[PDB]
Enzyme design. Sequence first.
Site, PDB file in Angstrom:
ATOM      1  N   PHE A  79      11.008 -15.429 -26.722  1.00 51.36           N
ATOM      2  CA  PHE A  79      12.477 -14.701 -27.387  1.00 51.36           C
ATOM      3  C   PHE A  79      12.266 -13.230 -27.354  1.00 51.36           C
ATOM      4  CE2 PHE A  79      13.688 -18.735 -26.975  1.00 51.36           C
ATOM      5  CZ  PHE A  79      13.856 -19.572 -28.404  1.00 51.36           C
ATOM      6  N   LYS A  80      11.217 -12.685 -27.325  1.00 50.09           N
ATOM      7  CA  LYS A  80      11.245 -11.241 -27.232  1.00 50.09           C
ATOM      8  C   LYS A  80      11.965 -10.488 -28.441  1.00 50.09           C
ATOM      9  CE  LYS A  80      10.434 -11.418 -22.212  1.00 50.09           C
ATOM     10  NZ  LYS A  80      10.870 -12.710 -22.437  1.00 50.09           N
TER      11      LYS A  80
ATOM     12  N   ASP B  34      14.711  -7.017 -33.210  1.00 54.26           N
ATOM     13  CA  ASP B  34      15.778  -6.834 -34.262  1.00 54.26           C
ATOM     14  C   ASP B  34      15.427  -6.309 -35.445  1.00 54.26           C
ATOM     15  OD1 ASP B  34      18.748  -7.070 -35.587  1.00 54.26           O
ATOM     16  OD2 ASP B  34      18.979  -8.800 -34.209  1.00 54.26           O
TER      17      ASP B  34
ATOM     18  N   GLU C 178      15.240  -8.351 -41.301  1.00 50.57           N
ATOM     19  CA  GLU C 178      16.060  -9.551 -41.754  1.00 50.57           C
ATOM     20  C   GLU C 178      16.353 -10.489 -40.752  1.00 50.57           C
ATOM     21  OE1 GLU C 178      16.173  -6.008 -42.821  1.00 50.57           O
ATOM     22  OE2 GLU C 178      17.701  -5.772 -43.972  1.00 50.57           O
TER      23      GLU C 178
ATOM     24  N   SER D 240       5.958  -5.831 -17.852  1.00 46.69           N
ATOM     25  CA  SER D 240       5.287  -6.077 -16.598  1.00 46.69           C
ATOM     26  C   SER D 240       6.304  -5.633 -15.323  1.00 46.69           C
ATOM     27  CB  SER D 240       5.198  -7.631 -16.206  1.00 46.69           C
ATOM     28  OG  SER D 240       6.409  -8.340 -16.275  1.00 46.69           O
TER      29      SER D 240
ATOM     30  N   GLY E 236      -6.592 -14.237 -10.267  1.00 43.71           N
ATOM     31  CA  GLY E 236      -7.877 -13.788 -10.416  1.00 43.71           C
ATOM     32  C   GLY E 236      -8.156 -12.334 -11.128  1.00 43.71           C
TER      33      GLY E 236
HETATM   34  O1  U5P Z   1       6.541  -8.222 -19.876  1.00 41.40           O
HETATM   35  C1  U5P Z   1       6.976  -9.130 -19.552  1.00 41.40           C
HETATM   36  C2  U5P Z   1       7.395 -10.305 -20.636  1.00 41.40           C
HETATM   37  C3  U5P Z   1       7.826 -11.550 -20.333  1.00 41.40           C
HETATM   38  N1  U5P Z   1       8.037 -11.757 -19.016  1.00 41.40           N
HETATM   39  C4  U5P Z   1       8.577 -13.317 -18.814  1.00 41.40           C
HETATM   40  O2  U5P Z   1       7.587 -14.084 -18.291  1.00 41.40           O
HETATM   41  C5  U5P Z   1       8.091 -14.951 -16.932  1.00 41.40           C
HETATM   42  C6  U5P Z   1       7.859 -14.350 -15.849  1.00 41.40           C
HETATM   43  O3  U5P Z   1       8.140 -15.066 -14.804  1.00 41.40           O
HETATM   44  P1  U5P Z   1       7.916 -15.105 -13.163  1.00 41.40           P
HETATM   45  O4  U5P Z   1       8.104 -13.595 -12.818  1.00 41.40           O
HETATM   46  O5  U5P Z   1       6.602 -15.583 -12.929  1.00 41.40           O
HETATM   47  O6  U5P Z   1       9.234 -15.881 -12.597  1.00 41.40           O
HETATM   48  C7  U5P Z   1       9.869 -14.759 -17.516  1.00 41.40           C
HETATM   49  O7  U5P Z   1      10.002 -15.756 -18.219  1.00 41.40           O
HETATM   50  C8  U5P Z   1       9.724 -13.504 -18.088  1.00 41.40           C
HETATM   51  O8  U5P Z   1      10.968 -13.380 -19.084  1.00 41.40           O
HETATM   52  C9  U5P Z   1       7.605 -11.077 -18.052  1.00 41.40           C
HETATM   53  O9  U5P Z   1       7.968 -11.470 -16.986  1.00 41.40           O
HETATM   54  N2  U5P Z   1       7.200  -9.854 -18.510  1.00 41.40           N
END
Ligand code: U5P
Lengths: 209, 209
Positions: free
Chosen positions: A58-59, A62, A65, A114, A177
């Site tokens: 859910f990242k 906020d 509270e 990412s 890997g």
């Molecule tokens: O930095 C981050 C944090 C979380 N996700 C999550 O990880 C999954 C990666 O999906 P995919 O690119 O393998 O399809 C998604 O649910 C995405 O919201 C990322 O891709 N990068």
Amino acid sequence: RLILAMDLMNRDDALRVTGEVREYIDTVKIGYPLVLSEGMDIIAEFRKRFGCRIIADFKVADIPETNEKICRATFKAGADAIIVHGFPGADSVRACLNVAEEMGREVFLLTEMSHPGAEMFIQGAADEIARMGVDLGVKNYVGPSTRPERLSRLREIIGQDSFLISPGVGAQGGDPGETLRFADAIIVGRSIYLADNPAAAAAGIIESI
Amino acid sequence: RLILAMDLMNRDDALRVTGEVREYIDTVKIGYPLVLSEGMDIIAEFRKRFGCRIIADFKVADIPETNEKICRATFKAGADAIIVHGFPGADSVRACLNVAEEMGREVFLLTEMSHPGAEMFIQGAADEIARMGVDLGVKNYVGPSTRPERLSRLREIIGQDSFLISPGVGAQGGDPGETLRFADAIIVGRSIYLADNPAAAAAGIIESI
Ligand SMILES: O=c1ccn([C@@H]2O[C@H](COP(=O)(O)O)[C@@H](O)[C@H]2O)c(=O)[nH]1
Ligand SMILES: O=c1ccn([C@@H]2O[C@H](COP(=O)(O)O)[C@@H](O)[C@H]2O)c(=O)[nH]1
């Protein structure tokens, strides 16, 4: 060492794919694409049907509270862990940790993302966000498969005993890997759930390690 | 379909045996022999170290108010489910169900026990206790391996969709295969944890099904 990112929006498709690849995974990561389409009850359904641990991605980002309220609802729904952003600061992370303690659950701290845009602001704060996690007692982290040098740096800060999971494998360009040289587990979404044969795709990824 | 009843009192021995048999089980049942000796923190330690679901076999049998307190502490400690006695009545079971709902966890209802003394009072009330569970929405039950005819009767009352686990296999005389004709999973303690080779004992039980 494989976590399925189940981001399909339809309950039937999500159940189909998850059941097909169950033997290759040990955890299912569920996020807003599925929950906002099918409801929070989907978390308990998955836990019951497949018996896998569920991480709610859910990242949370906020104020303290509201973070408390979001974590409480998420754990009440049955999630084993929740992924929270560290960028909003220590008080916001602490609020999540407090609810996890009351509920006997876990918090994963997202330190660097990412995607390309993560380089704009998050990357420059990532080491400090990770240090903050260590200072707060966080033991579970999320780092980028797409930047293994950053994943190595994150691993250096959190230590060998902390658990580190990593998304960005496959579709975003990350390698299974190489990512597993630093992370404990890899998160894979599209490479598996959009494949003509999800089970074969999952087997292939595991075979490639 | 094998659940380890980890009733050793020493943390080191409990960790040793559980780690040795991890490949043969999918859940660890933890009760008061281990918790009253090593503390409630042992639940979270087990969940973290082995990644198995934990059922707290506390046989909750108090008034509603106290039952609520016991379940809350147990779920806060990280247990995935708690075993509760049905003999104290519906209000006492409902109190446990209410806390499980607030916490996103599960309640298993113990309807008939496995030891000889269970025939004195519990057996005569067991069908009604099971019916009460169905009426309250309970979906997880515990029945005796030592009396498969009673296990069959219990299965008849709760239906095929309810999950039924069964202790009394091995040391108490119950048979794995016969018990699994009616139960979804068998609980095994001493036959595994007192064996010279726990892993071989677990493998043997599975091979016998
Ligand atoms: O930095 C981050 C944090 C979380 N996700 C999550 O990880 C999954 C990666 O999906 P995919 O690119 O393998 O399809 C998604 O649910 C995405 O919201 C990322 O891709 N990068
Ligand atoms: O009717 C019941 C309910 C629970 N247990 C529990 O299941 C385990 C069975 O252990 P063992 O006889 O396989 O050693 C013990 O933890 C015990 O408390 C029973 O044996 N019978």
